Amino acid sequence: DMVKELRDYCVRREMPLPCIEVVQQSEFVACCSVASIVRYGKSDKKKDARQRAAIEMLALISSNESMEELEALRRKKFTTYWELKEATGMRLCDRHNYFKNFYPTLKKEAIEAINSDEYESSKDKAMDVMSSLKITPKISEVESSSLVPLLSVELNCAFDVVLMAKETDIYDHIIDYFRTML
Amino acid sequence: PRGYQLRLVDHLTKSNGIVYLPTGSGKTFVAILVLKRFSQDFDKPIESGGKRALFMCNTVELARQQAMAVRRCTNFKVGFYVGEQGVDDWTRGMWSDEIKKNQVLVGTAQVFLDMVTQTYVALSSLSVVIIDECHHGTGHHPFREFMRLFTIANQTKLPRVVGLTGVLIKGNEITNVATKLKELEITYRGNIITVSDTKELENVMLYATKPTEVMVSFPHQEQVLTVTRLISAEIEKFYVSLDLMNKKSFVKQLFNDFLYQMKEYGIYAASIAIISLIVEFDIKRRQAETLSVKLMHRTALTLCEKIRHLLVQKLQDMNVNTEEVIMNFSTPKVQRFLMSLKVSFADKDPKDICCLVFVERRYTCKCIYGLLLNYIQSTPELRNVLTPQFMVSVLERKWQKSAIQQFRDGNANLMICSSVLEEGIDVQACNHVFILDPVKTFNMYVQSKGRARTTEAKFVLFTADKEREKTIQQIYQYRKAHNDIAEYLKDRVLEDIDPFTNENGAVLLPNNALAILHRYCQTIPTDAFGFVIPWFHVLQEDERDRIFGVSAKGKHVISINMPVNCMLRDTIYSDPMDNVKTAKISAAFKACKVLYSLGELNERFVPKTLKERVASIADVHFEHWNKYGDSVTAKDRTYKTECPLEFYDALPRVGEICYAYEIFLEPQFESCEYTEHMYLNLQTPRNYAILLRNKLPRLAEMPLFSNQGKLHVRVANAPLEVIIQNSEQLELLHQFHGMVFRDILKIWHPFFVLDRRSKENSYLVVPLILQKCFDWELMTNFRRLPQSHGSNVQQREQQPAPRPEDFEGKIVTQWYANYDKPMLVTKVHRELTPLSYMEYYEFTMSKYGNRIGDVVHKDKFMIEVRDLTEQLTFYVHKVILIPELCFNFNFPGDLWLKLIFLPSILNRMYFLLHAEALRKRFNTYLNLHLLPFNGTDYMPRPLEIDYSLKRNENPWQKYMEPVDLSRNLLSTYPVELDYYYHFSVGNVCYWAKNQFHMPTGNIYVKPLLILQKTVSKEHITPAEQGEFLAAITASSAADVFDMERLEILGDSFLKLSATLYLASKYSDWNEGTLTEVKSKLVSNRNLLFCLIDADIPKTLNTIQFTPRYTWLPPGISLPHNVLALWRENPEFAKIIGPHNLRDLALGDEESLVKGNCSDINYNRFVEGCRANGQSFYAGADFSSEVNFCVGLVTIPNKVIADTLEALLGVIVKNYGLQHAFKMLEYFKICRADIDKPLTQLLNLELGNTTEIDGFLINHYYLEKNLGYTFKDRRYLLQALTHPSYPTNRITGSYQELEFIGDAILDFLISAYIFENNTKMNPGALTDLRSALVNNTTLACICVRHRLHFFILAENAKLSEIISKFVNFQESQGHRVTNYVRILLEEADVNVDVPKALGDVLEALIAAVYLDCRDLQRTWEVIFNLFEPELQEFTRKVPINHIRQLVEHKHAKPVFSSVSCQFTCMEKTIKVYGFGSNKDQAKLSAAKHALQQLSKC
């Protein structure tokens, strides 16, 4: 069931909806243009050709669910064409709203924590902000001129957010990025 | 008028030069032509008169561009000495060796400053120094230091300096233009030379009308916004962190550019710049290997996204593509521009308005395109009137090419263009030229103001209030500069005789003499690229003195050099005259006078048309056309038929000798159950014989066929000689003949009567029994086969008991429920009896309820019968029963079987006897009638069957191209950004080697036998009888052979011989006159008339063999009275038809003893003929049906010409070319001169060393690649000289040799294909031949063998069209791909395949032959050149394009009778097909459609 699988990788990977159209009479050529990328699969039957083209489109789009479970918790993504049926993807311009496009509840905790100044606000203010947003920090050192060693913090999201700063202020920049984006 | 390029090249050849060409990118063609006009000494060594050239450039990268360009466009060896190659520290030894190998030394000015300054290469050694970007050479510069080297060296031995520049003065130095330009002239030792401002080249510096002008103001932002500072600070924090690293500079540059775009073009436009930066950084992050480098590109992206989030949030305060969001958040500059665009472009005529906006950088263009599209779309006032586009990695180039064309075509109205530092904007004249970013260079000002070309057009320039005064000052300085450069350049720009009356009294005037010369130049054969015109040249003082005395000392003389295609080749020197005008007028008069005298102009002084030239030679060569009533100077036919000479008057008499040639049928199959009845019976010694008064030659052994198997027929060479001793024995013979065709095999029609007059086909067939003798008892008893009467039961009682011997081999028919079906008694089943049950008395009785009575005999033998076939045509590949009931003709089984095969042996023999007659005649004429294998000792070989006969540029396509991420920034889905990466990396889809190097790899001699038979008479083989029979057998006859394969060799040879004959006889003609007279000397009509005059069309095998409805049997004819009437009255003949003839119903005496029809029957017949016309089916052409009766055939005008060609083919194959040439004067195609024999056409004359060698610079490499070394290199020179070559006055064009060459190639290729491809049908051989001698298959080989580097031409078009083709082919692999075949050619009226490339290959083939004069050595070259393409095309033959269109599975050809309709991805698309002739037009339309189908 290639049509179903392609429709899925499209809806799941946050790619746009695939549109399959066969036009030649004779024995059938399917032109599918998921996202201005058009590949042609031609076979004997109307229904049969579509399947071949869908593999062709799938192969190119795939080439480019353990992680997804977490992200599903943080967003209202449908996660299946049918789930979309259950009831126009992200463009390169609108990816800037990742953290910002999140569940009112987790952020509302983070917004309160980052604004609130009631504790040992060192890495306990930053950790709180991210912990509410279900975020794990992959902290790592710089590779040269390590005076007040810089840390490269990578968060576990599709956006691939990596923040670099001085040891003392790495903990302040995390707080700042989060503030601006939410 | 000659193009600026050619005139510039002439001026540069005459004197030093600085070519200032602002636009058109034609600097390269001029650089290449000058380099070629000074290349007569690039071969000689420096030790004795050698000379080399230099191409000094400012930059190494520019030098690479110019070295590659020289190698591609020239046959000159090119060295590339650039300082980075450790070219420094070179000993005199090395600079000596490198000037020995290379000729055009291309490099950087520093390398050659050192070379010339040190005594390494003297300026005397140089013929031409070309300096690129000559503006740079001012004050202290390697260019200026080089020219001072010139000012110290010995004079009278200094090179020709040709500087090239597009920007006359360096940027912003505008103070004293005049002084700077004078200094530049003094430096390069020669005046600047530029073209005027006309249609062909738009000059920027010399345009007069100036556009209306506007300067617009905008104030400083009242408050800097907060997000501008914050975004600025965050990029500072990033700069500190990334500074601590390990590439880094590029990441920094992009962020600094963004900052520029943000401050100068506004907050909103930054929202479109950050999307651009994200794309770039992502592409790069993927293009990495070290994880740490990738880390820099990842952290940058995270900042970019924070930026888009921030910059967007500010706008969000008010999709944010609304007019009121672009307006409120934009630097006052952009607010002014957006309003100014809106108010001005309120004419609202999309087609009328055209606006060019110039911006500072590349990224700016990207961002402003974005801002403009989103403002326009959201603004009701501008939307639908304004469409934007931006003009500024291999894929990147193609996208811009589409954008520039979109603006030029007129789809897009606005073009945002980046800075043009040293180049001219290449767009049409705009209307409102806006400059958003301030002008920084004079070149920017002149190039920009240049685009506004009408007074109506406006030039608007945006400057801030504070800088307004300073800009008003610089614009006045840039306007004064323009007006000064303009005057200096204005000076330096590229700008009564009595009549003669002919004998007739027409008057040539010296005014029209140029017009008449131009018409004569339009007549001579020219390429699609354009006509060639005469070349005028004023003579300098030294020449005037040498040619003429004090007569032209103070006077001017101009010479006119006619094109080589014109007959006149000698230069005509004009009258010594007072003015330049009386020089040109006189030169023209003198040329027209000489052309008239050479018979190239009518008595009315107007060049002769092709028709008039043909009319003069029409009587000389086409005289025979007159009798038939059709003349050369502006279907089918009915011919009689003649039996062979041996069959005419062959009726045996009753007092003379009679020859019986017994016919021996020999089965060639295996005995089985199926064929046992066939083998034994056919081999029985009871054969029939052909009895005739005349003797017969030795006839070949023909293959007949049958259901069982093939069998061989052999008429015996020796005749048993017998004399008839009676007149009743003759009647026995005649009656037995009548009864075979009347009864044994029914071929009888009511009209048929025995033909007792000898007349035609009068031979007899007689039974023969064991030596041998005529069977006289069989003849008596079977005068008429008895009727199957059958009988009654009581009658059946008295019948004697059947005896075994009685029915051993005889023939029987079943009386129960059947009519006249004869069957052969294979064996008597004596052992079994009627009572026995079958694996039976009842079986038969039940089967015929009343038809059979009770059997009289309970016990008897039962006969086994195998029925006999009903078909009388044989050329193309256990019913045990009761005896009492079957009727027993006593006829032998032995003969009945053989006589079924008789009608098809008799027909084949008629035609084989015609074949022997032709053999003898031709052999006698060629005087080979005495050779021992052609004499009385000739023993012919069997007919053999032809088993072959059926009877027996980028790799990616359109849809795979990624979207431009740049032109669609705000709506590119993240998926594409990944596709772009892989596709670009290709995951989804030199100075030591000479240009003329043939790559050693596989793309994709054994002597011709005809050329061995031509040289040695030992190899000659006998012209066989089967070959002449195949050569007269048309394909419609449905036989085992045909004239089609021999016709290919015959047509090839007839075209070669006509070419050689016309080229030798008339050697002062053009290809145009020679190719027309040839195409009319080998035309179907000429050949048809020739064959009709030779009487060959009557003796032809063209009509199928339906032995019953379309055949009169030998010795059996129509009633003599009726046959006389048909011939006597042409009027009745028309009405005499099938229905009338069948009603005659002759019987007994009328159809046997008495020949003539009875008077009553005659009356019945004539009344019948009148009735049809007066009643119904009147005026019907019953000619097909009743032609067979009177002996007439209808043959098309095609088969007759094909037969002539096939006879020529037989002669060529068996006797070589010289004996075949004699045949062409036999048919009176080629009239033969007394002075020059026809046979010696091959060796007939088909037609200073140092001068010839000058044109052929690296001919060693041409000869090495061609495989033939030229002794007389005058043939090489003429093979290479395009008609557009002014310097080659020694020889003529390539056009004379191509004529001779296309014939030598066609003939040799065809002989090879015939001899080696004998398993391919004649249709496939015609296709393989037409696809091996195409003009696109020859152009591919010419490029493959690198022979196009030596073509001598100076045409702009031809050179571009040759380069596009060679670059196409270099990628294709140098193979004849489908795409090359679909490319448009010159013949199909935009040309992709230049014709010149292919004619030059044919001419080189001709030149090879004229030097060697050996068709064997001409073949060794042709084979080596065509060996790769012969192998591939034989494996898969290239189909006619018609076939590709018709056989397009998805597409449906719809030709109009030639517009063609087709289906591409099922979209209705029709492309018009054009062509002068419908047959050629059909192909042409297909090709166009096929390209269109690929276009999809």
Residue numbers in the entry:
A (entry chain B): 95 to 120, 127 to 164, 188 to 210, 216 to 310
B (entry chain A): 8 to 24, 25A, 26 to 253, 273 to 344, 352 to 425, 436 to 538, 554 to 581, 582A, ...
What does the report in the manuscript say about this coordinate set?
The RNase III enzyme Dicer-2 associates with its partner protein R2D2 and cleaves long double-stranded RNAs to produce 21-nucleotide siRNA duplexes, which are then loaded into Ago2 in a defined orientation. The Dicer-2–R2D2 heterodimer has critical roles in both siRNA production and siRNA loading onto Ago2. The present structures illuminated the detailed architectures of the individual domains and interdomain linkers of Dicer-2, which were not visible in the previous cryo-EM reconstructions at approximately 7 Å resolution, and revealed that Dicer-2 comprises an amino-terminal helicase domain, a DUF283 domain, a platform–PAZ domain, two RNase III domains (RIIIa and RIIIb) and a carboxy-terminal dsRNA-binding domain (CRBD). R2D2 comprises two dsRNA-binding domains (RBD1 and RBD2) and a carboxy-terminal domain (CTD).
We determined the cryo-EM structures of the Dicer-2–R2D2 heterodimer and the Dicer-2–R2D2–siRNA complex at 3.3 Å resolution. A structural comparison of Dicer-2–R2D2 and Dicer-2–R2D2–siRNA revealed that, although their overall structures are similar, the central linker becomes ordered and interacts with Dicer-2 CRBD and R2D2 RBD2 upon siRNA binding. R2D2 RBD1 in the Dicer-2–R2D2 structure was not resolved in the density map, suggesting that RBD1 is highly mobile in the siRNA-unbound state. R2D2 interacts with the helicase domain and the central linker of Dicer-2 to inhibit the promiscuous processing of microRNA precursors by Dicer-2. In particular, R324 and E331 of Dicer-2 form salt bridges with D288 and R223 of R2D2, respectively. A structural comparison of Dicer-2–R2D2 with DCL3–dsRNA suggested that Dicer-2 recognizes the 5′-monophosphate of dsRNA substrates in the 5′-pocket and cleaves the dsRNAs 21 nt away from the 5′ end in the RIIIb active site, consistent with a previous proposal. The modelled dsRNA sterically clashes with the helicase and CRBD domains of Dicer-2, suggesting that these domains undergo structural rearrangements upon the binding of dsRNA substrates.
